[PDB]
mmCIF file of C-alpha atoms and ligand atoms in Angstrom:
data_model
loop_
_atom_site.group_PDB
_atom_site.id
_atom_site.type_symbol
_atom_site.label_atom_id
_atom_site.label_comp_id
_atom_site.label_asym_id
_atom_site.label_seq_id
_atom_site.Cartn_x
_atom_site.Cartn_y
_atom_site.Cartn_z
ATOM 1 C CA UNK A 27 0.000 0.000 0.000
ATOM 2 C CA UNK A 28 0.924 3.521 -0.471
ATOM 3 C CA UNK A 29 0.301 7.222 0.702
ATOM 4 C CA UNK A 30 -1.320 9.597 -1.902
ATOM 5 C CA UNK A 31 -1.404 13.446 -1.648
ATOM 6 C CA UNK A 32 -5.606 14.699 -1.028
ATOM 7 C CA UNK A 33 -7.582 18.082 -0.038
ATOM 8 C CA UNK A 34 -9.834 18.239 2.480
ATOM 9 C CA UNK A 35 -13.041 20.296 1.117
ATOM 10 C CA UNK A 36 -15.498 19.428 3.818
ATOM 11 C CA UNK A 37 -16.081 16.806 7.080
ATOM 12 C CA UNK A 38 -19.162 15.412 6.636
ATOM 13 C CA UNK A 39 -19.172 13.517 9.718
ATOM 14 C CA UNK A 40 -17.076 11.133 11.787
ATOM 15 C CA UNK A 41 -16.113 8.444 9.034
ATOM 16 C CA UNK A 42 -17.125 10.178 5.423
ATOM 17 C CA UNK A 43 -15.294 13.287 3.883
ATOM 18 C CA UNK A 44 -15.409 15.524 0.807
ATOM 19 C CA UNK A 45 -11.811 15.210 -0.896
ATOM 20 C CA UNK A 46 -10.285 16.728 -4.242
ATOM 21 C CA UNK A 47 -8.181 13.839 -5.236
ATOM 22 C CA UNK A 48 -6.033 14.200 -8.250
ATOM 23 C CA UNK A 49 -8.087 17.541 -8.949
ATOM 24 C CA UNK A 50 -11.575 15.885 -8.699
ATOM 25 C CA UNK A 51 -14.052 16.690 -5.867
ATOM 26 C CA UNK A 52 -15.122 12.967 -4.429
ATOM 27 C CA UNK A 53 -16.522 11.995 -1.131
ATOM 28 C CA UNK A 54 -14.503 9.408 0.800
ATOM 29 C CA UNK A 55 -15.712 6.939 3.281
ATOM 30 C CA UNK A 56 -13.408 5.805 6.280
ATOM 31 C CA UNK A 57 -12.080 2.206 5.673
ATOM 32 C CA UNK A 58 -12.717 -0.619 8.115
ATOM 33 C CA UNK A 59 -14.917 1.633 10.977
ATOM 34 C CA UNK A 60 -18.513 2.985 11.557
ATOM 35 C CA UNK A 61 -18.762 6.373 13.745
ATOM 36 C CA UNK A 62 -22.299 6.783 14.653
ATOM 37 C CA UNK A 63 -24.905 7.695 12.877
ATOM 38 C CA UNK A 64 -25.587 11.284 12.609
ATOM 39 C CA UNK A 65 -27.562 11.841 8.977
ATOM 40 C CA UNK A 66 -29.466 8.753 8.316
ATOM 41 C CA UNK A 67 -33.276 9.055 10.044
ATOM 42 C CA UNK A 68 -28.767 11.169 15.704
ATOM 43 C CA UNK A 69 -26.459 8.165 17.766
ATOM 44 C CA UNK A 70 -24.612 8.746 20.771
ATOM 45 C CA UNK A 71 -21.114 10.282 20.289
ATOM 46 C CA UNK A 72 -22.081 11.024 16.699
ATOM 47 C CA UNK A 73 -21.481 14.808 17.294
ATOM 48 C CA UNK A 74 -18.139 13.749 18.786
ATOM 49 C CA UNK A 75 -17.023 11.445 16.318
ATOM 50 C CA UNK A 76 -17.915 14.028 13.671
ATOM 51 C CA UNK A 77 -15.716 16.507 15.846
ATOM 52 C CA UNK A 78 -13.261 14.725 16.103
ATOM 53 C CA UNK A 79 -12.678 14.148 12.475
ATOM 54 C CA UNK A 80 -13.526 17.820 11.592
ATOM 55 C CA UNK A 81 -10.523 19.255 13.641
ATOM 56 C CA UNK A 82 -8.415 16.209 13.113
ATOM 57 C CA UNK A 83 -8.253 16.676 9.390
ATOM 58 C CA UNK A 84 -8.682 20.496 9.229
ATOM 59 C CA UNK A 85 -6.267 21.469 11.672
ATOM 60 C CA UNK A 86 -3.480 19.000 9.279
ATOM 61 C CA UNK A 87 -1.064 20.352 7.106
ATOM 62 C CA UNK A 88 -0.661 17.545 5.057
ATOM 63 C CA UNK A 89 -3.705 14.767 4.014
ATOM 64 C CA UNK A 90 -3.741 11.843 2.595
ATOM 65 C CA UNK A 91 -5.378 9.125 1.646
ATOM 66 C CA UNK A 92 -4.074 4.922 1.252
ATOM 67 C CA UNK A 93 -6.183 2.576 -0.808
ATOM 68 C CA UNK A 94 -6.358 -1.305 0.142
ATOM 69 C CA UNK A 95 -5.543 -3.977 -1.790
ATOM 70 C CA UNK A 96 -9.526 -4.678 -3.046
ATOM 71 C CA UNK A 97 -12.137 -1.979 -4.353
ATOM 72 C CA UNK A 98 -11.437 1.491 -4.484
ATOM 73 C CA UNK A 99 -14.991 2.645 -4.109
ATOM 74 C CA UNK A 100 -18.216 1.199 -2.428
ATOM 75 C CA UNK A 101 -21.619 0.913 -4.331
ATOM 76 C CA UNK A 102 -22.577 4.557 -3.310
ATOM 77 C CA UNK A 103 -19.296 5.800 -5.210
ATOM 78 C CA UNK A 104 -17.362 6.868 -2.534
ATOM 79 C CA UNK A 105 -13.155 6.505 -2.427
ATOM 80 C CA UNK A 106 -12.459 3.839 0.279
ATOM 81 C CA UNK A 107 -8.960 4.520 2.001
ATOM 82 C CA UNK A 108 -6.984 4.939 5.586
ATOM 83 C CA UNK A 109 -6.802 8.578 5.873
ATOM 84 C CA UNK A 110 -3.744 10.355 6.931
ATOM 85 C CA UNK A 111 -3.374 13.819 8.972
ATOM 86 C CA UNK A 112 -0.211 14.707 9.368
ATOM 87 C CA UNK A 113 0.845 11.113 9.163
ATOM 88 C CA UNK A 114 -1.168 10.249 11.655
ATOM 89 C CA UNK A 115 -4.316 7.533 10.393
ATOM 90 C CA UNK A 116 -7.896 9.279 11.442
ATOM 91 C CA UNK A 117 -9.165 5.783 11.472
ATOM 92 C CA UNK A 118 -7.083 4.206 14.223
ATOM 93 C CA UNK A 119 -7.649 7.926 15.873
ATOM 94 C CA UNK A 120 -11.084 7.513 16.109
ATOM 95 C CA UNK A 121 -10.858 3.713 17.234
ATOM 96 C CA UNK A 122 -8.439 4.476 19.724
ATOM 97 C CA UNK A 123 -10.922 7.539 21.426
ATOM 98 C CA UNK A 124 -14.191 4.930 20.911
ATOM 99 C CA UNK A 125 -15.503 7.105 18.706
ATOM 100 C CA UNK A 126 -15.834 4.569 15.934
ATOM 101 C CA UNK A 127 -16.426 0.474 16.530
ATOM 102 C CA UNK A 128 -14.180 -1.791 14.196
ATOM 103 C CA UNK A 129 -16.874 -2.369 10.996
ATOM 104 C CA UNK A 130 -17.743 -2.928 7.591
ATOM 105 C CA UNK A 131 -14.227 -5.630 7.483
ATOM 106 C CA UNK A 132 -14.560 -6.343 3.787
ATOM 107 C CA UNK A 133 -12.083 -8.899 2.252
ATOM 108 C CA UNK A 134 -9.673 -7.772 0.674
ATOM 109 C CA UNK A 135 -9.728 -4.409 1.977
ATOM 110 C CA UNK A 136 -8.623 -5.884 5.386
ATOM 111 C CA UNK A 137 -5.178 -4.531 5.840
ATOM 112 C CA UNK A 138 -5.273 -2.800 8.844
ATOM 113 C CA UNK A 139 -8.159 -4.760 10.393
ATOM 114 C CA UNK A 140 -5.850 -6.157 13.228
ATOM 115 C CA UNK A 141 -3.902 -2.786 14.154
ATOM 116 C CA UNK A 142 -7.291 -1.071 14.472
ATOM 117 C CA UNK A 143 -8.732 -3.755 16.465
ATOM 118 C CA UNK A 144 -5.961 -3.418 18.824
ATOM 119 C CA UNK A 145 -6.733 0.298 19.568
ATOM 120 C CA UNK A 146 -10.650 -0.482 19.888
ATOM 121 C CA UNK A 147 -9.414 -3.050 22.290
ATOM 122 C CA UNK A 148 -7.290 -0.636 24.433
ATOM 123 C CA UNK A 149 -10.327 2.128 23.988
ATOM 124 C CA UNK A 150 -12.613 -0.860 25.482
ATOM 125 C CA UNK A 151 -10.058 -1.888 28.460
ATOM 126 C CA UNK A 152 -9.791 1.612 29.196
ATOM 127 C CA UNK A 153 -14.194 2.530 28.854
ATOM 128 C CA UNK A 154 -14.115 5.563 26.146
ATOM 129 C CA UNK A 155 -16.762 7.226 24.927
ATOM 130 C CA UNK A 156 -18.875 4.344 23.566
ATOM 131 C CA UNK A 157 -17.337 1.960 25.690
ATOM 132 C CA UNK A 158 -18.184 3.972 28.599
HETATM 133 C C1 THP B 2 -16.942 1.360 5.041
HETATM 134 C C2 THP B 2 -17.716 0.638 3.902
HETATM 135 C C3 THP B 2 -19.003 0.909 3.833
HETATM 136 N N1 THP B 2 -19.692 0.307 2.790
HETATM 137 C C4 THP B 2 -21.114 0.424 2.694
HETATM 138 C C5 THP B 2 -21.760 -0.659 3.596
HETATM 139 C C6 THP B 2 -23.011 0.045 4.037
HETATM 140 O O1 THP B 2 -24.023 -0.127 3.004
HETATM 141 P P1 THP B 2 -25.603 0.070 3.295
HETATM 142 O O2 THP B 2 -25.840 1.513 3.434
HETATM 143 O O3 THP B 2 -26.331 -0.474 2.055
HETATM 144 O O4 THP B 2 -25.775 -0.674 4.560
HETATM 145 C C7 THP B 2 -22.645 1.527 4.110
HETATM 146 C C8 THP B 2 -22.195 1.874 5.529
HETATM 147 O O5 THP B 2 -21.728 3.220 5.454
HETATM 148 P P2 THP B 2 -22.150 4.407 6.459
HETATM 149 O O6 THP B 2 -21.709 3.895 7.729
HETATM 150 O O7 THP B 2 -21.509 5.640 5.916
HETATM 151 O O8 THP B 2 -23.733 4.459 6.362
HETATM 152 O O9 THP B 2 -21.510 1.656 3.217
HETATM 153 C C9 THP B 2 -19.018 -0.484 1.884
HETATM 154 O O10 THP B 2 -19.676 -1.033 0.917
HETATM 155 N N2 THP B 2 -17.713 -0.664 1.935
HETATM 156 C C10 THP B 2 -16.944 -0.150 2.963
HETATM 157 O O11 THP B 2 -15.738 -0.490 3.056
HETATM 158 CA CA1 CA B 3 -21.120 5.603 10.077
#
């Protein structure tokens, strides 16, 4: 796998972004977790999550985004990647605060599935957010 240069244009929430990658406006969906639900017809630490990710990825100088090894997109178009601030991967982030559960673990995209289950673990063991 490898690191590719993106914009942030807009946080949507806590797991699903509005990128320009390689000059095209897309919307990008957080590999391998699910913050809660805010949009669909409001979750518990939704409004978190989606802060979380909002000043995460704003406050960065440098984004970008790392494709798995499987599908680049899901059936609702969106890029599917890790997601870099400052070299730093907003998915474990959010994990690690339990502000997102482990989810969606789609073979082949599965790459970091064990590295983020070990921060949900430690977020668990130590009764974050939603593990509180
Ligand atoms: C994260 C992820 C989500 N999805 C799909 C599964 C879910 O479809 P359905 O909506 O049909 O259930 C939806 C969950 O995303 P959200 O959590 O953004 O709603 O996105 C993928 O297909 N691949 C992925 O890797
Ligand atoms: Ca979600």
């Amino acid at each position: 796998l490898h690191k590719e240069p993106a914009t942030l244009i807009k946080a949507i929430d806590g797991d699903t972004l509005k990128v320009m990658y390689k000059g095209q406006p897309m919307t990008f969906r957080l590999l391998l977790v699910d913050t809660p639900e805010t949009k669909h017809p409001v979750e518990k630490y939704g409004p978190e999550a989606s802060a979380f990710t909002k000043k995460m990825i704003e406050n960065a100088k440098k984004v970008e985004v790392e494709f798995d090894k499987g599908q680049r997109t899901d059936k609702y178009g969106r890029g599917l990647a890790y997601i870099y601030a400052d070299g730093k991967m907003v998915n474990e982030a959010l994990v690690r605060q339990g502000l997102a559960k482990v989810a969606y673990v789609y073979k082949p995209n599965n790459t970091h599935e064990q590295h983020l289950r070990k921060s949900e673990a430690q977020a668990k063991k130590e009764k974050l957010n939603i593990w509180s």
